[PDB]
Amino acid sequence: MAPVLENRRARHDYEILETYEAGIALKGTEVKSLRAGKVDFTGSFARFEDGELYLENLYIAPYEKGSYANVDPRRKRKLLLHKHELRRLLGKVEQKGLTLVPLKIYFNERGYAKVLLGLARGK
């Protein structure tokens, strides 16, 4: 029914310039919180270590309505990007006024989650 998180920022706010395809795996219960998780997709960021794609400004909230000093959700963070995918999509946002967000995170109990990056050029 509800897909783990959705790409609102680019389909809703911007046309995407550079993108990447990552595979984010889940733990066993990650699928209830992940498939039943709500993350803020947009105004989000991902970090490119030319080998790893870390969740950076993408917070995952499965159901922590009552947040405190720092409540951990479950996603944990650290999306996985084929490094060729991380440097190619992210290399375009570095221009000026561009962001990097895994607009769409799809998840499956097979440890297979699909992450789509959308680099939006605001200029």
- Tell me the technique behind this structure: NMR
Phi, psi of 120 (to 5 degrees): -105, 130
Domain ranges of the chain: 1-123
CA atoms within 13 A on the CB side of 106: 9
- Considering the domain delimited by 1-123, tell me its CATH architecture: Beta Barrel (2.40)
Rounded to whole angstroms, the Cα distance separating 115 from 112 reads: 10
Rounded to whole angstroms, the Cα distance separating 94 from 63 reads: 34
